[PDB]
Amino acid sequence: LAPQA
Amino acid sequence: TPATSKATIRDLNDPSQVKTLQEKAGKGAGTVVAVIDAGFDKNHEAWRLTDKTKARYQSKEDLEKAKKEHGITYGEWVNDKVAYYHDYSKDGKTAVDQEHGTHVSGILSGNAPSETKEPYRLEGAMPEAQLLLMRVEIVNGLADYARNYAQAIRDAVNLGAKVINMSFGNAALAYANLPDETKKAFDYAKSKGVSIVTSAGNDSSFGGKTRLPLADHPDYGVVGTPAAADSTLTVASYSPDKQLTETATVKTDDHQAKEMPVLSTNRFEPNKAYDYAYANRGMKEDDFKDVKGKIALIERGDIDFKDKIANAKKAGAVGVLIYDNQDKGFPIELPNVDQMPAAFISRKDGLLLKDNSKKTITFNATPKVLPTASDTKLSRFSSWGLTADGNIKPDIAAPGQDILSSVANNKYAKLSGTSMSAPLVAGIMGLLQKQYETQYPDMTPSERLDLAKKVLMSSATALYDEDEKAYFSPRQQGAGAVDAKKASAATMYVTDKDNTSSKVHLNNVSDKFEVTVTVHNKSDKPQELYYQATVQTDKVDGKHFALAPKALYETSWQKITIPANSSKQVTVPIDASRFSKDLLAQMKNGYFLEGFVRFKQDPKKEELMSIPYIGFRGDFGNLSALEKPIYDSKDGSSYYHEANSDAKDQLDGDGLQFYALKNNFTALTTESNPWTIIKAVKEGVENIESSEITETIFAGTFAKQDDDSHYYIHRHANGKPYAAISPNGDGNRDYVQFQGTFLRNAKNLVAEVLDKEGNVVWTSEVTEQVVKNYNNDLASTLGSTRFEKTRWDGKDKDGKVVVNGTYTYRVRYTPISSGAKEQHTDFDVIVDNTTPEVATSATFSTEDRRLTLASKPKTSQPIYRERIAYTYMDEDPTTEYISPNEDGTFTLPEEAETGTVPLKMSDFTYVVEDMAGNITYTPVTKLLEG
Ligand SMILES: [Ca+2]
Ligand code: NA
């Protein structure tokens, strides 16, 4: 869900 | 000393002003609310009532009586707070996740006691209501999923729920495709005055959170179902300008103590003075030179967070501070890498720490309310409208960044998402419905619900983008940010001309149009208001929508007096003709003309009401649903596929990839089958022996005779791709199959073949529902879709192979929009089954190892490859190829490096292939002995 980068 | 009484989170941070509404309408005692989600911790300390004697269900016996009344023979009482639990998806093999549903439920109705380990008590919006907890999860398809939560809705209504929160959804799905049972459940809830609140979704726009959609393609909404149902209240996520946050403290050069927000994964030691060191973006080991024993301070960018965190641990860091590379960004929850403490901070705070002298930082144990780096700003992840059918969603916005609530195993955590926004609005809706039972007692429940939704949307505050100097688009924020104080105080609301909703849909517009709204006054005295409309569109950066608003102009303030207990219409003329040239230069297929009609008691006072309007300057229903074929791209690129600039015609196939994240574009697929595998299936080899494999490739692509591991597009003189099949059952270029990158949803996708003489010779089975390719990610959807129903094997209606010639492979599909014309994309496909006529005799020259053929090959389609293979055993079986010399002969070698192994004459095979895949293979021995 959250940005990985 | 009496027992310690802790403050609640809302006592310190209440961005939506829930306390004002609670002062008017209570905290939920005697009321029941329902949460439909994926799983719950039913034993959480947050599930408690202050006075169970006021509850609707005082015991398991009261609940079973209600069940018997409605014929419900499943589900159970749990405790005084959780009056009902049922799992509607028990046939699922996967384990139950309890985090997300517990978190949502805590926002709606958590009621943690002062005995909690937390510094501040979680007290949800309706902390004294009882909960019905309903588990639903996908098990056997999306239709069955909808049938299951339709039953949960109906059970919730019949067990007395006043509001139902659904913090889940599936992106881009159309309302019309829901089962009738599901549509009837929504209507049943509305007929009983039961509110249903849905999350907008966390899918940003078409392309996802790492991309911007293309300015040529304005229908970039990704809101799905259940949110797309008109009767629900769909909630987007934004960040307020302040938030209760954990903090860290640093001594600066000219401000002594300086507190900054941190968002931590795992735990730093509170009140411990850590040292830190700058480590660039954490990409090289040299970055972590002075990091041993300290906190690595790392800038966002280039590599993944988990990579930066692991690299810091490798160099002996005790923790990680990662600061944003965006200005006014949002806190991002960092991944847990082997328990490593890691905190995210803003760019301003990161740059401050970088240039700070005393590089020592201390984490504080008590959270406090600090300004947010983002200021008031809509969440980047929040799903944009419009719905598949083109209706206006979301409806409203609520805080959804880093919300602290209950999770599994009696714990608490912060989470971001529209799933956190929705239960806050659900709680506000429930309390406003309670207020209206006293304020409007002669209405029915359904009339009170309809009023509450209109007041919530009207009284919501249109959020303003300070950087762009315009209001955030209604397709992103709906009717504004919810405000429980304004909503509780409201005696007026505003709707469209037909009194159906607090939003105005204008469908297609020209540059001149009118916005008509009705102002409803429910008070005993006449009221005078000033109104004005904003006129705005999308901001555009180069070829992309910026996902930001562009102000065009605002109308002049006008006046209206609404008599008591009555309503009046007003009409605002809009004329954007002077902008059309510049806007059409940016958005050539049309653009939205949208805004808000804003109402005030006096032009210098604060906004009292606001209603959004949306129109499309163009023909929205007939926007192209399909991205043009990759073959028609000048630079070789597409939305999800970047080309090799030094080779724009290169187009490699699937290869040995496991996932299909590469090559997502519109094209035709086929298969390449080497001659060795064709032979092994003629002879009957069980499990294949050879070094070559069958590969899925794109039609119209061909390797070079001097193999280099790449395929390339070939085209006719006119420019179309050279697509050709040889339907002879050998698996080499036998078929074509449609692969599509859909920019919009579509229905009734079907492939047909035309003989270019005026007849349809074949028609595929129909694919009824097509969903837009709104991302290119395994966690959501891939950037293109392969449609197996469109596979054409070269046969006709009756089942006979069609004759040699060129045909039209036609793919038809229709957009979801009402009255949309059918669209289609055509491919020229050659059929040719003519076997190559190769030479049957050959003489060999022992002097120079040159093999002379008796005749040159004869093929119907142009020659693809003339080669001589040789298979040798290398460390147990490789196969390489030889190209013909310029005089026609082939030079055969005597060995082959691996070591070095000799080559017998029995190892060579003459292989001839045409551009349709027709192939002949003959051992060179049979050529010599003949
Ligand atoms: Ca074939
Ligand atoms: Na509003």
mmCIF file of C-alpha atoms in Angstrom, chain B residues 724-883:
data_model
loop_
_atom_site.group_PDB
_atom_site.id
_atom_site.type_symbol
_atom_site.label_atom_id
_atom_site.label_comp_id
_atom_site.label_asym_id
_atom_site.label_seq_id
_atom_site.Cartn_x
_atom_site.Cartn_y
_atom_site.Cartn_z
ATOM 1 C CA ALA B 724 1.478 -13.865 -40.658
ATOM 2 C CA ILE B 725 0.365 -17.316 -39.510
ATOM 3 C CA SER B 726 0.808 -20.843 -40.874
ATOM 4 C CA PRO B 727 -2.046 -22.878 -39.324
ATOM 5 C CA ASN B 728 -0.581 -26.371 -39.735
ATOM 6 C CA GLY B 729 -0.714 -27.506 -36.100
ATOM 7 C CA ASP B 730 3.045 -27.473 -35.446
ATOM 8 C CA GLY B 731 3.008 -24.633 -32.899
ATOM 9 C CA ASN B 732 5.186 -22.230 -34.920
ATOM 10 C CA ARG B 733 3.229 -19.024 -35.620
ATOM 11 C CA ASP B 734 -0.082 -20.902 -35.770
ATOM 12 C CA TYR B 735 -2.305 -18.184 -34.297
ATOM 13 C CA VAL B 736 -2.711 -14.544 -33.327
ATOM 14 C CA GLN B 737 -4.223 -13.358 -30.042
ATOM 15 C CA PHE B 738 -5.187 -9.860 -28.920
ATOM 16 C CA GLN B 739 -3.312 -8.154 -26.079
ATOM 17 C CA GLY B 740 -4.693 -4.797 -24.986
ATOM 18 C CA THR B 741 -3.795 -1.865 -22.769
ATOM 19 C CA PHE B 742 -7.217 -0.401 -22.011
ATOM 20 C CA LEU B 743 -7.328 3.272 -21.048
ATOM 21 C CA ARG B 744 -11.043 2.979 -20.209
ATOM 22 C CA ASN B 745 -13.391 0.198 -19.197
ATOM 23 C CA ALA B 746 -15.181 -1.531 -22.062
ATOM 24 C CA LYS B 747 -17.849 -4.142 -22.730
ATOM 25 C CA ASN B 748 -18.556 -6.813 -25.343
ATOM 26 C CA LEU B 749 -15.008 -7.254 -26.623
ATOM 27 C CA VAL B 750 -15.043 -9.517 -29.695
ATOM 28 C CA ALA B 751 -12.600 -10.397 -32.479
ATOM 29 C CA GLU B 752 -13.653 -11.067 -36.072
ATOM 30 C CA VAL B 753 -11.815 -11.796 -39.323
ATOM 31 C CA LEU B 754 -12.649 -10.131 -42.648
ATOM 32 C CA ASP B 755 -11.602 -11.575 -46.015
ATOM 33 C CA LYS B 756 -11.131 -8.080 -47.555
ATOM 34 C CA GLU B 757 -13.789 -9.087 -50.104
ATOM 35 C CA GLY B 758 -16.854 -8.133 -48.045
ATOM 36 C CA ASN B 759 -17.481 -11.108 -45.753
ATOM 37 C CA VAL B 760 -16.938 -12.012 -42.105
ATOM 38 C CA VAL B 761 -15.300 -15.450 -42.172
ATOM 39 C CA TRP B 762 -14.940 -16.005 -38.399
ATOM 40 C CA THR B 763 -16.077 -14.535 -35.082
ATOM 41 C CA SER B 764 -14.668 -15.132 -31.603
ATOM 42 C CA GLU B 765 -16.459 -15.717 -28.337
ATOM 43 C CA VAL B 766 -17.341 -12.526 -26.475
ATOM 44 C CA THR B 767 -15.513 -11.075 -23.471
ATOM 45 C CA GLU B 768 -18.357 -9.268 -21.725
ATOM 46 C CA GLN B 769 -16.471 -7.104 -19.194
ATOM 47 C CA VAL B 770 -13.107 -5.360 -19.648
ATOM 48 C CA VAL B 771 -11.479 -3.333 -16.841
ATOM 49 C CA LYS B 772 -9.052 -0.491 -17.571
ATOM 50 C CA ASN B 773 -5.347 -1.214 -17.008
ATOM 51 C CA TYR B 774 -5.066 1.384 -14.248
ATOM 52 C CA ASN B 775 -1.614 0.283 -13.018
ATOM 53 C CA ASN B 776 1.286 -2.007 -13.927
ATOM 54 C CA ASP B 777 1.923 -3.701 -10.586
ATOM 55 C CA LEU B 778 1.422 -7.187 -9.180
ATOM 56 C CA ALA B 779 -0.423 -5.842 -6.120
ATOM 57 C CA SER B 780 -3.205 -4.312 -8.252
ATOM 58 C CA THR B 781 -3.323 -4.923 -12.010
ATOM 59 C CA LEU B 782 -0.911 -5.379 -14.900
ATOM 60 C CA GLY B 783 -0.506 -2.769 -17.632
ATOM 61 C CA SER B 784 -2.062 -4.944 -20.346
ATOM 62 C CA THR B 785 -4.385 -7.941 -20.626
ATOM 63 C CA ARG B 786 -4.232 -11.021 -22.864
ATOM 64 C CA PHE B 787 -7.693 -12.114 -24.037
ATOM 65 C CA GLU B 788 -7.669 -15.845 -24.767
ATOM 66 C CA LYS B 789 -11.168 -15.671 -26.288
ATOM 67 C CA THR B 790 -9.813 -13.635 -29.229
ATOM 68 C CA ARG B 791 -7.301 -16.303 -30.301
ATOM 69 C CA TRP B 792 -7.701 -17.050 -34.021
ATOM 70 C CA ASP B 793 -6.209 -20.326 -35.269
ATOM 71 C CA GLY B 794 -6.715 -19.508 -38.959
ATOM 72 C CA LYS B 795 -9.985 -21.455 -39.321
ATOM 73 C CA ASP B 796 -13.370 -20.103 -40.417
ATOM 74 C CA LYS B 797 -16.934 -20.409 -39.088
ATOM 75 C CA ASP B 798 -17.197 -24.071 -40.126
ATOM 76 C CA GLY B 799 -13.710 -25.090 -38.974
ATOM 77 C CA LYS B 800 -11.733 -25.149 -42.240
ATOM 78 C CA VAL B 801 -8.405 -23.376 -42.667
ATOM 79 C CA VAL B 802 -8.828 -20.252 -44.780
ATOM 80 C CA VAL B 803 -7.010 -19.982 -48.094
ATOM 81 C CA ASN B 804 -3.693 -18.208 -48.565
ATOM 82 C CA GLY B 805 -4.060 -14.440 -48.574
ATOM 83 C CA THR B 806 -4.234 -11.381 -46.366
ATOM 84 C CA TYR B 807 -7.125 -10.860 -43.953
ATOM 85 C CA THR B 808 -8.414 -8.204 -41.568
ATOM 86 C CA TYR B 809 -8.224 -9.215 -37.904
ATOM 87 C CA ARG B 810 -10.758 -6.834 -36.349
ATOM 88 C CA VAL B 811 -11.207 -6.272 -32.606
ATOM 89 C CA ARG B 812 -14.420 -4.551 -31.466
ATOM 90 C CA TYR B 813 -15.279 -3.122 -28.035
ATOM 91 C CA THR B 814 -17.645 -0.499 -26.606
ATOM 92 C CA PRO B 815 -17.030 2.055 -23.816
ATOM 93 C CA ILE B 816 -19.215 1.934 -20.710
ATOM 94 C CA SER B 817 -20.536 5.478 -21.149
ATOM 95 C CA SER B 818 -24.221 5.767 -22.012
ATOM 96 C CA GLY B 819 -24.790 5.972 -25.764
ATOM 97 C CA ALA B 820 -21.139 5.371 -26.664
ATOM 98 C CA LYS B 821 -20.329 4.225 -30.191
ATOM 99 C CA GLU B 822 -18.562 0.913 -30.702
ATOM 100 C CA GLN B 823 -14.823 1.264 -31.290
ATOM 101 C CA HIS B 824 -12.473 -1.096 -33.106
ATOM 102 C CA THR B 825 -8.823 -1.689 -33.982
ATOM 103 C CA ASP B 826 -7.768 -3.571 -37.128
ATOM 104 C CA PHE B 827 -4.732 -5.735 -37.917
ATOM 105 C CA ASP B 828 -3.761 -7.110 -41.323
ATOM 106 C CA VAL B 829 -2.943 -10.816 -40.926
ATOM 107 C CA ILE B 830 -1.502 -12.970 -43.715
ATOM 108 C CA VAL B 831 -2.386 -16.668 -43.826
ATOM 109 C CA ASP B 832 -0.057 -18.972 -45.754
ATOM 110 C CA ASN B 833 0.367 -22.743 -45.371
ATOM 111 C CA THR B 834 2.716 -23.322 -48.327
ATOM 112 C CA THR B 835 5.605 -25.553 -47.280
ATOM 113 C CA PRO B 836 9.035 -24.343 -48.462
ATOM 114 C CA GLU B 837 10.413 -26.228 -51.471
ATOM 115 C CA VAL B 838 14.030 -26.755 -50.444
ATOM 116 C CA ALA B 839 16.845 -28.660 -52.139
ATOM 117 C CA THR B 840 17.002 -32.444 -51.777
ATOM 118 C CA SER B 841 20.611 -32.971 -52.945
ATOM 119 C CA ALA B 842 23.910 -31.413 -51.893
ATOM 120 C CA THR B 843 27.607 -31.940 -52.635
ATOM 121 C CA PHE B 844 30.326 -31.336 -50.047
ATOM 122 C CA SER B 845 33.803 -29.944 -50.765
ATOM 123 C CA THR B 846 36.373 -31.646 -48.531
ATOM 124 C CA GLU B 847 38.991 -28.961 -49.262
ATOM 125 C CA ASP B 848 37.305 -25.869 -47.782
ATOM 126 C CA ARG B 849 34.330 -27.485 -45.966
ATOM 127 C CA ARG B 850 31.786 -25.746 -48.222
ATOM 128 C CA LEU B 851 28.382 -27.389 -48.709
ATOM 129 C CA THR B 852 26.836 -26.590 -52.107
ATOM 130 C CA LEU B 853 23.072 -27.035 -52.464
ATOM 131 C CA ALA B 854 21.414 -28.428 -55.580
ATOM 132 C CA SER B 855 18.891 -25.574 -55.762
ATOM 133 C CA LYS B 856 17.809 -22.357 -54.030
ATOM 134 C CA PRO B 857 14.720 -22.601 -51.787
ATOM 135 C CA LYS B 858 11.266 -21.613 -53.023
ATOM 136 C CA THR B 859 8.835 -20.060 -50.541
ATOM 137 C CA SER B 860 5.446 -18.388 -50.885
ATOM 138 C CA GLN B 861 6.082 -15.841 -48.152
ATOM 139 C CA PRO B 862 9.536 -14.183 -48.232
ATOM 140 C CA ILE B 863 12.367 -16.150 -46.635
ATOM 141 C CA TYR B 864 12.702 -15.653 -42.873
ATOM 142 C CA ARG B 865 15.807 -17.757 -42.145
ATOM 143 C CA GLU B 866 18.079 -20.068 -44.161
ATOM 144 C CA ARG B 867 20.366 -21.758 -41.643
ATOM 145 C CA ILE B 868 22.299 -24.935 -40.898
ATOM 146 C CA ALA B 869 22.107 -25.939 -37.247
ATOM 147 C CA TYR B 870 24.491 -28.185 -35.342
ATOM 148 C CA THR B 871 23.833 -29.722 -31.927
ATOM 149 C CA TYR B 872 26.786 -30.784 -29.780
ATOM 150 C CA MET B 873 27.082 -32.011 -26.203
ATOM 151 C CA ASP B 874 28.532 -29.284 -23.958
ATOM 152 C CA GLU B 875 29.002 -30.299 -20.307
ATOM 153 C CA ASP B 876 26.390 -33.021 -20.790
ATOM 154 C CA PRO B 877 23.318 -30.113 -25.291
ATOM 155 C CA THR B 878 23.814 -26.812 -27.141
ATOM 156 C CA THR B 879 22.626 -25.902 -30.645
ATOM 157 C CA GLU B 880 24.117 -23.137 -32.805
ATOM 158 C CA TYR B 881 23.527 -21.951 -36.364
ATOM 159 C CA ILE B 882 25.423 -21.071 -39.543
ATOM 160 C CA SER B 883 24.430 -18.496 -42.185
#
